[PDB]
């Protein structure tokens, strides 16, 4: 959900 796995 965060960092390299953030989605915008």
């Amino acid at each position: 959900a965060v960092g390299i796995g953030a989605v915008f």
Partner: antibody, heavy 124, light 108 residues
């Protein structure tokens, strides 16, 4: 060649302010959908994430174990990503790395990069 | 505050053997897990993200598995170039946190 290169004096007396710069060359610091991190490693021990930011927003995120002492920032005119640590002590001695990693869901073909690390000694 | 508990702290196996490192998270992290390799004196280099998706250039003898709270990295045919520290990292929540690390030795 896209590369991260770190600079900054690494030898500190106790209670000085550590100041490190991470310069990207071959790319722009503003290139979107990268997650930039500062990470540190004491000799013989594991890795600790200090904090970081996404290149497409202006927030920066901090580890709570260090947030009272560190400022992480970014200067797009000089392509610099920066770490400042106030009141360093015995415990801050470590190799400090920056990293630029793709935000995978919006950037599958950008390049994951690391600095060479800077060795920080806090000593009298 | 999500703890990553990595085991074992060190492991020793002959060239060609099959080794596993495990990593358990203090709370559900779905498949938001990366594994990194660090050779002595060098920066870490990521072997995989999303629990099991290898990065480019990473030999296919490395593989990962797991979803939820327990995760495994496997090395199918341990090679001498594999002498390194290995770290898991979760990225389900800030702050990012790493496993304590595993040192890999070749048994000769």
């Amino acid at each position: 060649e896209v590369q991260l290169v770190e600079s900054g004096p690494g030898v500190m007396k106790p209670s000085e302010t550590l100041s490190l710069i991470c310069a990207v060359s071959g790319d722009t610091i503003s290139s979107p959908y990268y997650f930039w991190s500062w990470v540190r490693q004491p000799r013989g021990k594991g890795l600790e994430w200090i904090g970081g930011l996404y290149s497409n927003t202006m927030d920066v995120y901090y580890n709570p174990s260090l947030q009272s002492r560190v400022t992480i920032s970014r200067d797009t005119s000089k392509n610099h990503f920066s770490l400042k640590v106030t009141s360093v002590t015995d415990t801050d001695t470590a190799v400090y790395y920056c990293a630029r990693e793709r935000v995978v869901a919006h950037n599958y073909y950008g390049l994951d990069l690391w600095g060479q690390g800077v060795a920080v000694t806090v000593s009298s | 505050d999500i703890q990553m508990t990595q085991s074992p702290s060190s492991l020793s196996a002959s060239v060609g053997d099959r080794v596993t490192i495990t990593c358990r998270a203090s709370q559900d992290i779905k498949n938001s897990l990366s594994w990194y390799q660090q050779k002595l004196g060098k920066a870490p280099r990521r072997l995989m993200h999303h629990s099991s998706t290898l990065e480019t250039g990473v030999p296919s003898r490395f593989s990962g598995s797991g979803y939820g709270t327990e995760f495994t990295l496997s090395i199918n045919s341990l090679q001498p170039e594999d002498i390194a520290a290995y770290y898991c990292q979760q990225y389900e929540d800030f702050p990012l946190t790493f496993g304590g690390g595993t040192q890999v030795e070749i048994k000769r």
